[PDB]
Amino acid sequence: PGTEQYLLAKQLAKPKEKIPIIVGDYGPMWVYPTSTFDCVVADPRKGSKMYGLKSYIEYQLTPTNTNRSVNHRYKHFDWLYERLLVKFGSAIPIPSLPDKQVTGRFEEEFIKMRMERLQAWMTRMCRHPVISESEVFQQFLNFRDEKEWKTGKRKAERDELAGVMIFSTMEPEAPDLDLVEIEQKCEAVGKFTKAMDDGVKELLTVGQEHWKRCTGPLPKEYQKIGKALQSLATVFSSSGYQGETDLNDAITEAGKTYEEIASLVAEQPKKDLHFLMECNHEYKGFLGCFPDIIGTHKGAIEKVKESDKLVATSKITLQDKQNMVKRVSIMSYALQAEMNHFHSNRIYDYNSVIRLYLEQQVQFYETIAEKLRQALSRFPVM
Amino acid sequence: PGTEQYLLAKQLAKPKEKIPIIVGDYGPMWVYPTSTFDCVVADPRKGSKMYGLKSYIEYQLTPTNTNRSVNHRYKHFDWLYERLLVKFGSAIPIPSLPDKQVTGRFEEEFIKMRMERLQAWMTRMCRHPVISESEVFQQFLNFRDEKEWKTGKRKAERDELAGVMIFSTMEPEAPDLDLVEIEQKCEAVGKFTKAMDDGVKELLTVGQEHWKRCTGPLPKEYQKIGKALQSLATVFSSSGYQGETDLNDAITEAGKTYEEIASLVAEQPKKDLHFLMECNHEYKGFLGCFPDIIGTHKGAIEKVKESDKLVATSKITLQDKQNMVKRVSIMSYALQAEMNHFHSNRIYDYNSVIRLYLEQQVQFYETIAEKLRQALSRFPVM
C-alpha cells in the first residue's frame, strides 16, 4: 500500500500548501478564515464549442466573495468531485454528486432539482476550511478563459500530493499523541459514524413510508368521505321536504372541504418531510465516506504497531520508527479536526431541519383545523 | 292477503283508539302532544324469579314525564319491539333492536353499549306521536306489579287491530285523495328511501375504512417516526462532542411527542366518527323497514286498480268500490304523515351529528398542532 510511502517516505519534503491544525477549547480543529464565503449556483443556459444542437446545460457560479461569475457544465463539477476525492478523500469526507436521471434532461424537473443538489454540494465545499482554500477549488471558481481552465485542469490532475500523502502537508500545532490514544480516537469515530449511519438509514426509511402514505391512501380517504357526504346531500336535496336548502348546502360544502383537504394532504410532504429527507440523504452521503477513511487510519496504526519488530529485525532504523510515530500522530489530528467540523455542522443542520419540519407540520394541522372550522360555521344551529 | 280484508271489510267497526291526521302548513302530519316526554334507560342490576344465579340484567325505565320507575329485562324490550312491529309495522318504520354479542354478557363492554343503543331506541319511540300514545306502549311504562304486566301482556298479544288493519283506526281530517296522486306519492317515497339507503350505506362504508385506518396503520406511522427520532438522538448523545445536551433532549422529546400523537390518533374515532356511524346505522335500520311498507301500499293500490273490473263483473258493489277508494286514501295520508315525521327528524339528526363530528375533528387537529408547537418551543434557536 501507498500508506507505507507516507509513513516511511525519504521525506525532507517541504510542502507548498500548508494546512494548519490547532487545539481550540474543545479538541483539535481546522483553521477557519475570518471571512466565510458561499457560492451561488444558478442561471442555467445552453452552451457550445463547435457541437451543434446537442447543447449542454451550463450553470453559472457566483461566489458571494468577489461576485465575479464563471460558467460550468455538469461534467465540470463531476471533474472537481473526483479531484477532491483523490486529493482529500483519505482525510475529509467528500459527499458524492447526484447521478443521471431520464433521457429528457433539458427542463425544470431535471436541471432544477439538479441545480438544487448541486447548490447544496457547492455550499458544503465553499464552507469547508480546507477544501475552499485549496488551489484546485480556488482556481475552479476564479479562471478567466479557456486558457486558465485548461492549465488549471492539468496541474490538478497531476498533483501527486493526494491519497494518504495529503497528511504530509498538515502541520498540527500541538504535542505528539501516543499510539494508545490514537487507536481509541479512531475506534470511537468508527463506532459513532456506523451507529449514526444506521440511525440515519432508519429515518430515511420511515420517511419514505410516510411519504408514500401521504400521497397515496391517506388523500383517497378524505376524498371518499367528501364524495360520500355529497352523494348523501344530493339525495337529501330531492326529498321534496321544505326548508332544507339550509342544511344540504352546508353538507355539500363540507364534502367539498374534505376534497380540498385530500389535496392539501397529498401536497404536504414537499413542504416539510422533503427537507428532513434531503438533510438525511446528504448525511448518508457523508457517512458513506468513513469506512474508507477509517480503513486508512486503521491500516496506518497497524503498520506502526510493527515498527518495533522492524527495528529489531533491522528492517528499518530507530529514526524511521519515530517518523512513523510522528506521522501517524498527524493523521490522528486531521481525523479529529474533521470530526470536529462534522459534529459542529451536524448539530446545526439537524437543529435547523427538525425545527423547520415541526414548524411546517404545525402550520399544516392548523390549516386543516381552519378549513374544518369554516365548513362548520356554515351549518345552521339546529 | 289480509290487505283485502281492510279494503273490503264489512266494516262499520267504530274504533277504540283513534289516530288523527291533519294537514298542517306543509303536508299531512301526525298530531303532536303539547308535552313531549322521553325515557331514561339506566341503572342495570341483577334480577330473579326462583332461578338461582343465571341472573339476568334488568334495566330501569324512568320517563321524564311522571318520573315513576319500572324495571325491564332485555327480553321485555324485544317483546315490545315485536308488538309494535305487528301493530304499527305496516305504517310506521320500527327500528330493530341490537342482537346477542359474546357469551360474557355480564359487564361494561356488553350491558353498557347495549344500554346505550336501547336508550336511543326508547327515545325514538317515546318521541313518536303515535307510538308513545298507544296502549301497549303506555302500559309498558306504567304498570305497578306482576299482575298488571301480565294482563297488559295479554290484551296486547291479542290486539287484532294490527297489520294493515291499523289504518282503520286512522281519521284523516282532509278531503279524499284520487288514485293518481296516491300512486305518485307512494312512488316518490319508494324512490327517496331507496336512494338514501344507498347514500347511507356508502357513508357507513368509507366510515369503517377510515376507522380501521385511524386505529391500525396511521398510528403506527407516527409511532415509527417517533422512535426513529429517538434512536437518532440517542446516537447523537454518544458523540462525545460538547454543548449538545441542548438539541438531543429536544429531539428525544419530539420523538416522544409523536408517540403521544400516535395514541391520540388511535383514540380519535370514538369521539367523532363513532357518532356519525351510529346515526347512519340507526337510519339504515329505519330505511330497512320501507321495502315492506311500500309493498303494502303498492299492493293496496293494485287492488283498487281492479275495483272497476270487479264492479263490472259484479264481484263487488259500487259502495264497496268507493270504500276501497276511501280507505286507500287514508293509507296515503298515514304514509305522508310518517314521511313528514321522518324528514323532520332526519334533518335535525344529520345537522346535529355532522356539526358534532366537525367540531370534534377541529378540536383534534388543533390539539395535534398544539402538541407539535410544544415540542418545537423546546428546540434551541440555532
Number of domains of chain A: 3
Tell me about the largest β-sheet of chain A.
Answer: 3 strands, mixed
Give me the number of helical elements of chain A.
12
Helix content of chain A: 55-70%
Measured by residues with Cβ under 8 Å of the partner chain's Cβ, the largest interface is: A-B, 65 and 65 residues
Strand elements of chain A, count = 6
CATH topology value of the largest domain in chain A: Substrate Binding Domain Of Dnak, Chain:A, Domain 2
Beta content of chain A: 5-15%
Specify the structural class of chain A.
mainly alpha
Order of helices and strands of chain A: HEEEEEHHHHEHHHHHHH
Strand order of the largest sheet of chain A: 2-1-6
- Gyration radius of chain A, in Å: 29 Å
- The quaternary structure here is homodimer
CATH superfamily of the largest domain in chain A: Arfaptin homology (AH) domain/BAR domain
Distance between the termini of chain A: 85 Å
PDB class: structural protein
Keywords: sorting nexin, membrane transport, PX domain, BAR domain, tubulation, structural protein
Assembly: dimeric
Entry title: SO4 bound PX-BAR membrane remodeling unit of Sorting Nexin 9
